[PDB]
Amino acid sequence: EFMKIAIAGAGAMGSRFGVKLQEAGNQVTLIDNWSAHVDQINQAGLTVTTDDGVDHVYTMTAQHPEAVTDQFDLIILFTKTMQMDAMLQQLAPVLTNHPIVLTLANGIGNIETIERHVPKNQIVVGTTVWSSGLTGPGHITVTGTGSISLQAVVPDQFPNLADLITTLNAAGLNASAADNVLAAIWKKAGLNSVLNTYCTLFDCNIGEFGALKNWQTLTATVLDEFQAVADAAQIQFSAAAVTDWIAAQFPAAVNGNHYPSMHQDMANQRPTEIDFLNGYVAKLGQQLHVPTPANALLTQLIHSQEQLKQI
Amino acid sequence: SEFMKIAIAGAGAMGSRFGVKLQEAGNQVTLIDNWSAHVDQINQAGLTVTTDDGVDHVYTMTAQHPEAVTDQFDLIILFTKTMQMDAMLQQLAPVLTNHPIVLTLANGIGNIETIERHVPKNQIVVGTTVWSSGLTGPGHITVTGTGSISLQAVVPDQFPNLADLITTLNAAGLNASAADNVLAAIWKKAGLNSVLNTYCTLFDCNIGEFGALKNWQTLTATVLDEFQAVADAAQIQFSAAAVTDWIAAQFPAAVNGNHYPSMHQDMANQRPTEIDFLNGYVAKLGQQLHVPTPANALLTQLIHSQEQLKQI
Numbered sequence: 001e002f003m004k005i006a007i008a009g010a011g012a013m014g015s016r017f018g019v020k021l022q023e024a025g026n027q028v029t030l031i032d033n034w035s036a037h038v039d040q041i042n043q044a045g046l047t048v049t050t051d052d053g054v055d056h057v058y059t060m061t062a063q064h065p066e067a068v069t070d071q072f073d074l075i076i077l078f079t080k081t082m083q084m085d086a087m088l089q090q091l092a093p094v095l096t097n098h099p100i101v102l103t104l105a106n107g108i109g110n111i112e113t114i115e116r117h118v119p120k121n122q123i124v125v126g127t128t129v130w131s132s133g134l135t136g137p138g139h140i141t142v143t144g145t146g147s148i149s150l151q152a153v154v155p156d157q158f159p160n161l162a163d164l165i166t167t168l169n170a171a172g173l174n175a176s177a178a179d180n181v182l183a184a185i186w187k188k189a190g191l192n193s194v195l196n197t198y199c200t201l202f203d204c205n206i207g208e209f210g211a212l213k214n215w216q217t218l219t220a221t222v223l224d225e226f227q228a229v230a231d232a233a234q235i236q237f238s239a240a241a242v243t244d245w246i247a248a249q250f251p252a253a254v255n256g257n258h259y260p261s262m263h264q265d266m267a268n269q270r271p272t273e274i275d276f277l278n279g280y281v282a283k284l285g286q287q288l289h290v291p292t293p294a295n296a297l298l299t300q301l302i303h304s305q306e307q308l309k310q311i
Numbered sequence: 312s313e314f315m316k317i318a319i320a321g322a323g324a325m326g327s328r329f330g331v332k333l334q335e336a337g338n339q340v341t342l343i344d345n346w347s348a349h350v351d352q353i354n355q356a357g358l359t360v361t362t363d364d365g366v367d368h369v370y371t372m373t374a375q376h377p378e379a380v381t382d383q384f385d386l387i388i389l390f391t392k393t394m395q396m397d398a399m400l401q402q403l404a405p406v407l408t409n410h411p412i413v414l415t416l417a418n419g420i421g422n423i424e425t426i427e428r429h430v431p432k433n434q435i436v437v438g439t440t441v442w443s444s445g446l447t448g449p450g451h452i453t454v455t456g457t458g459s460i461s462l463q464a465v466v467p468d469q470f471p472n473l474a475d476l477i478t479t480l481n482a483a484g485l486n487a488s489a490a491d492n493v494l495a496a497i498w499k500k501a502g503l504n505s506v507l508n509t510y511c512t513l514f515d516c517n518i519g520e521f522g523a524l525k526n527w528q529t530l531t532a533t534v535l536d537e538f539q540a541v542a543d544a545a546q547i548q549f550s551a552a553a554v555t556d557w558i559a560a561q562f563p564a565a566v567n568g569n570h571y572p573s574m575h576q577d578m579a580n581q582r583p584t585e586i587d588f589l590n591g592y593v594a595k596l597g598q599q600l601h602v603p604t605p606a607n608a609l610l611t612q613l614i615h616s617q618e619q620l621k622q623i
Contacts, residue, residue: 198616201513201613202613202616202617202620203620204620208620208623212616212619212620213615213619214612214615214616217612218612218613218616221605221609221612291605293533293605293606294605294606294609297533297606297609297610298609300526300529300530300533301513301514301530301613303525303526304510304514304524304526304530305514307524307525308514308515308516308520308524311520
């Protein structure tokens, strides 16, 4: 089983998937907005450095999304939450043959974003534990092995699941169907909606958050609302499990001295992902008649902080 | 007998001015204060009062630290700040056994509840005043203009002689009247403070910067709609809309655009804030009256975390 495949968002992860899929016999296009990266791949090849320190160079097709004139059987989306709508907009002409759209992007309002651009029954969500590092333009460094877990958004109308799994497995990507993928993405969004958001508001690192005398109340306030919205959305969720995971980050040997991504975003005057974290639970809670006053307020506070940071 | 034995508890600018006037009117006055330089200066060289014409007037006054006080009184007038008030009353415990009138003119809004833990609530009277006074230094105030006081008994059907208290204040030229809009006025101010202080502190911004926010109205409503709901349950007059217009009036540079409110300066100096007597007080009272206050409760927690971080 082969497909014609587009990797939309060709960072570390996308580039690694692309090489493996091409080497397996699939036709692959890497789609990305970073010019240096797209140019380097086309001009000097994509460098893949393995554990033994050997540099492997692959001939790959890379394009900016507006330049893409081909159409595909499958789009694999790695583009971040906030860039995803623009990317799909630029690919409008590409989408008219109604491809499978597999989102492996981190974060949690990705389905809803994708729904504005393609019929929801062609959407599949996924997680993966494959890893990859972006060393520079046209250069990744890779190690270890991995797997992918997949869940159709509309299982009773998605015809292509078997084909999708066969194609990914034939490339050695180790994919399987599972019903708890959306739950896993929610669980991660729970952790992110406590640690990113509070660290940003307080200008502190993860250990300093965990040293707060009211860290448990702050965490519960957010997560009890997550739990209520997940319940109404019929997505498995455990506030208690997310809490244990958060607390596991506190020690210096894990993430005690790390500032999370939203904190760095704020520090660099970049717009944060708040509307895909606390803001998404608030918006979805609104739609399901579940009160989310804490998450709604935290979202507003972050928006105000962003506005002040660009004075 | 216009002649009362009076203690001024909290003898900053305002208390010192009240005290001098009440002493000069024929009352026996004790100034009670925690600032040693001030207490020493008053006892050693008198209280200096500088008037508009620049003339320095010096009065002989009695000042003590609360711990030292053994006298008893007919009236305590409280100016002590929300957060210091419990400690002050604690230190005066032996003094309070003759059940004095307690008149609180302190700014802020959980003062009655604090006082209730030390004296029966029916001896409590709340007040506002527009007398002004400036604290120039230890034992030295500068004063201007005239003023008035509005007074409201906390338990009007059990407070016997409000008229006597007014007679004593007025014989000293303080221009007091009975009114029943005082508690509402305190709530109104607590409303303004719970928006401007708290958000400016969280955002490290000034009042104009807050007003320039594209979501200033939502942030203000979130707090004030809860205030309105708790005031309603407490049967205290409150208007979110009027408080909102007052807040908005502060934004221009010509008013308070470039000022940082008191809580912001407190945070900047690693001082504990008055959050538990602002957003924290509405949250606690809302809890007691079964009114949800999730926004004010969270804002309170955020400010507590910020205080903790500021002392690393």
